[PDB]
């Protein structure tokens, strides 16, 4: 599902 490290954009 959708998730990201805080310093990265979504895919």
């Amino acid at each position, epitope marked *: *599902g*959708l998730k*990201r490290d*805080k*310093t990265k*954009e979504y895919n």
Partner: antibody
Framework: QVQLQESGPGLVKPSETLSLTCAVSGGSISDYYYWNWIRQFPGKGLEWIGNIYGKSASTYYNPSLKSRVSISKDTSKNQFFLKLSSVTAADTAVYYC????????????????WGQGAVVTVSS | EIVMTQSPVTLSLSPGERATLSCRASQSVNASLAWYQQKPGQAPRLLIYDASTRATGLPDRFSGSGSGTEFTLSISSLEPEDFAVYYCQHYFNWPLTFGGGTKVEIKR
């Protein structure tokens, strides 16, 4: 205590462009968050419109609106913006701005902090 | 898009009773499911995410469960202040979509 506040016209004529501003306090737009627009229809259904990243041009939009929506930001004013073109009565809704949720170093596209909602009617 | 459907549309229960709200996804969303509470005149408030993790400070009477296509929000003992519309939202893929809400009314 990040706070969001929508502003803009409450009445838009059919075929014209709906514009709204979200002013943010208690935090910077230029931050590691996506800033979102959501609307709630008179029947109480909720629809996600799209988002914009605080630290790049990255945007995601609902494909049902992609042809007529634009989200932008002005980090000198700490604001972000919604423009929805070619509106009709089906666009009458309460429009909310919101900041997505982060806990520690992980973020998810769910909404933590919301504005108060801007009521917009599309009518002649 | 993935479509979220909620049932029942409305619930009317006495204080102290357990409310069980259901959310169904049209395809599996695994655990990428959140719940919100919306009181009159207010924006929605995030309650639960990852199907079962409570937002910080949330009263323990709110609990989320489920996986895949079937999810539940439980309010273990209703209180008068719990009057609201409750919505689910997936975040499995784009676009994000919401269920149509369950309105919880309090008997007295």
């Amino acid at each position: 205590q990040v706070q969001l506040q929508e502003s803009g016209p409450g009445l838009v004529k059919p075929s014209e462009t709906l514009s709204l501003t979200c002013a943010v306090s208690g935090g910077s737009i230029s931050d590691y968050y996506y800033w979102n627009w959501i609307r709630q229809f008179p029947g109480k259904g909720l629809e996600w419109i799209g988002n914009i990243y605080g630290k790049s041009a990255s945007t995601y939009y609902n494909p049902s609106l992609k042809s007529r929506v634009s989200i932008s930001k002005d980090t000198s004013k700490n604001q972000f913006f919604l423009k929805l073109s070619s509106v009709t009565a089906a666009d009458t809704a309460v429009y909310y701005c919101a900041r997505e949720y982060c806990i520690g170093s992980t973020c998810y596209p769910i909404l933590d902090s919301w504005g108060q909602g801007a009521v917009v009617t599309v009518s002649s | 898009e993935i479509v979220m459907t909620q049932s029942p549309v409305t619930l009317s229960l006495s204080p102290g009773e357990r409310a069980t709200l259901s959310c169904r996804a049209s395809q599996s969303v695994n655990a990428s499911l959140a719940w919100y509470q919306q009181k009159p005149g207010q924006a929605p408030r995030l309650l639960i995410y990852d199907a079962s993790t409570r937002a910080t400070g949330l009263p323990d009477r709110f609990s989320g469960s489920g996986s895949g296509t079937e999810f539940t929000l439980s309010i273990s003992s209703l209180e008068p202040e719990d009057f609201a519309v409750y919505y689910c939202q997936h975040y499995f893929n784009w676009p994000l979509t919401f269920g149509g809400g369950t309105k919880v009314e309090i008997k007295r």
